[PDB]
Amino acid sequence: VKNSIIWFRKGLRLHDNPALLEACKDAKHVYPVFVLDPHFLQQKVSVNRYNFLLESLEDLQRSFQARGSRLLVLRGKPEEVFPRVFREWGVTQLCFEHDTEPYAKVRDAAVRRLAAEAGVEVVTPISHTLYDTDMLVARNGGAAPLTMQSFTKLVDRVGDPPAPAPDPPAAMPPPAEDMPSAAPAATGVPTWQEVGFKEPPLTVFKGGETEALARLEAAFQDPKWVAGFQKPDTDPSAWEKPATTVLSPYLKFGCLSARLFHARLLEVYRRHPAHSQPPVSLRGQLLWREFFYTVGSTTPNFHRMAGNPVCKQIDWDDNPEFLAAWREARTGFPWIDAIMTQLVTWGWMHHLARHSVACFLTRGDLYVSWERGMEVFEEHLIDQDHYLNAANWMWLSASAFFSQYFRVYSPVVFGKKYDPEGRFIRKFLPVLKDMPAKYIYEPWTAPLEVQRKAGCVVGRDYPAPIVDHAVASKACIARMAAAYRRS
């Protein structure tokens, strides 16, 4: 008889899950498995993202229970848990979604060898990205495209991505009864208190496939908004109703299928002939993700500067004081400190908000290495993605993909074009909620009578700016010039 395991790592969904469909085919018992390292925190992981993962597992648990099954959360390392449950459950097939991250390739190769020793068939479909990224490299002549323009031409020669896979059956083969490793008390979804976190999560975005599909339908409620979507023209100060889809955390964990997203976009584009085109369209945003996944998976040391063949070697400053002020949202620029506060409280900011803080830290003002601001994002972002966090930090720091270092965002003027009253600043920096709009972007310029009346004295209630932007940006720009010619 066929006993199969569907191993969840990413792809935390039932829709468009060809690995799940294969595991259920002709199966007598199916074991939905997620593997959890109970010592992961005793090692840089905010409770916002980890609770988002736990909420996504609870959603999977309810979706399996409704179909006669149960999600098994196994504690331990996969190289140890799988050899045991292979024999205990009589497993004949192991199915999981392909993953191209560096740690995943090392981990999955070992499990494959353990599966071969136990006579277990391994099926690993691709469904996390739009395409087989190795096929894109092969069709381009053996190397990944290094510009978005050549990448868009490549995917148009290849054609449409595969359609989303059918829904799983209404009833699933359950796990076998009375298996010791499947005991309910040892395979349940833990809470954030039980894994060791002391402070609760503060983000407003709930994890899970159900929430992902609900947010997807909300985005497509106005097809003209989807058709005319232009990414650079969206508002980074919009927080009550964010200017973009905020589907990145669901696409990161796989709660939402990228192919389903792409299939719904083409349905709208077929009825709106003047729809936006890449790279600014909504489809172009999925292509940015596909582009960085393709170039990152094929480039050594992609998450670092040294040994990275695509990254420029710039002599960044080792300045712990600047990094600490930026990390702790006390730079003295309310626009910067408000975004960094949104990073810690929500785990998500608009793309152009990430532009503002990443430029300020690196090539714009502080000249701190993009690797340092990266690890800050890796801790707090609920949508943190190994390849997307990397490539965008190299973009913003003019280390790769982007080379126009004379374009420096002003930490004072940028947000004022969108939000002159500073509604975004007052929401995330309530210490400035009474400051008049004339000074809310430059509170050090307000007269003291205004600072006292507003209850926000610069240097006592809110810090003075750590740098002069005109002096700092002039120095950084000229140094980047010395870095770029000496290359």
Q: Which of the choices ligand FAD, Cl ion, none does residue 410 contact, using the CB cut-off of 5 to 8 A by kind?
A: Cl ion
Report what 50 binds from ligand FAD, Cl ion, none; CB cut-off 5-8 Å by kind.
none
Residue 152 or 389 with smaller CB distance to ligand FAD: 389
State the angle between helix axes of 102-117 and 78-89 in degrees (0 to 180), rounded to the nearest 10.
Answer: 30
Binding mask 360-399 for Cl ion (x = CB under 5 A): ----------------------------------------
Task: Report, in Å, the least distance between residue 416 CB and Cl ion.
Answer: 9
Q: How many Å apart are CA 243 and CA 353, to the nearest integer? A: 12
* Binding flag, residue 235, ligand FAD (CB under 6 A): no
Q: Are 184 and 361 in contact (CB under 8 A)?
A: no
292 assigned ligand-binding residue:
yes
Return the ∠ at Cα 237 (arms to 406 and 355), rounded to 5°: 30
Counting contacts by CB under 6 A, is residue 358 touching ligand FAD?
Answer: yes
445 annotated to a ligand binding site: no
Is 10 a residue that touches ligand FAD (CB under 6 A)? no
Which tokens hold the place of 446?
A: 């307000």
Q: How many CB atoms lie within 10 A of CB 318?
A: 10
Query: Would you say 276 and 229 are in contact if contact means Cβ atoms under 8 Å apart?
Result: yes
Using Cβ positions, the residue closest to ligand FAD within the complex turns out to be: 244
Pull the structure tokens for residue 389.
């966090």
Give CA–CA dist 279/286, Å, rounded: 9
CA angle 18, 21, 24 (to 5 degrees): 150
Q: In angstroms, rounded to a whole number, what is the distance separating the alpha carbons of residues 478 and 473?
A: 9
Q: Read off the tokens for 131.
A: 């395409």
Contact status, residue 375 vs residue 44, Cβ threshold 8 Å: yes
- Is there a binding annotation on residue 56? no
Residue 410 touching Cl ion (CB under 5 A): yes
Residue numbers 194-233 binding ligand FAD by CB under 6 A? 231
Element (H, E) at 96: strand 93-96
User: Considering only 10-18, 73-81, 161-169, 241-249, which stretch makes contact with ligand FAD by CB under 6 A?
Assistant: 241-249
* Contact status: 383 vs ligand FAD (CB under 6 A): yes
Smallest distance from ligand FAD to CB 431, Å: 26
Partner interacting with residue 231 (select from Cl ion, ligand FAD, none; CB below 5-8 Å by kind): ligand FAD
The interface partner of residue 82, options being Cl ion, ligand FAD, none and the CB cut-off 5 to 8 Å by kind, is none
Nearer to ligand FAD, 69 or 203 (CB): 203
How many residues belong to the site for ligand FAD (CB under 6 A)?
A: 28
Quick one: the chain helix, strand, coil %, rounded to 5? 45, 5, 45
Task: Say which entry of Cl ion, ligand FAD, none residue 393 contacts (CB below 5 to 8 A, set by partner kind).
Answer: ligand FAD
Q: Is the dihedral of CA 390, 294, 402, 486 positive or negative?
A: positive
**Calpha distance 1→482 (Å, rounded):** 68
Site residues for ligand FAD, 243-262, by CB under 6 A, read 244-248, 251-252
**Residue 381, binding choice from ligand FAD, Cl ion, none, Cβ under 5 to 8 Å by partner class:** ligand FAD
Q: What are phi and psi of 177, to 5 degrees?
A: -75, 150
- Does the footprint of ligand FAD cover residue 401 (CB under 6 A)? no
Exposure letters 329-354 (e unless 16+ CB within 10 A, then b): bbbbbbbbbbbbbbbbebbbbbbbbb
- Region from 161-169, 220-228, 348-356, 450-458 binding ligand FAD, contact rule CB under 6 A: 348-356
Gap between the Cα atoms of 455 and 62, Å rounded: 49
Sequence letter at residue 65: Q
Known binding site for FAD: residues? Answer: 231, 244-248, 285-292, 348, 351, 354, 383-385, 389, 392
Binding site for ligand FAD (CB under 6 A): 231, 244-248, 251-252, 285-286, 288-289, 292, 350-351, 354-355, 358, 377, 381, 383-385, 388-389, 392-393, 396
What does the binding site for Cl ion look like in residue numbers (CB under 5 A)? Answer: 409-410, 414
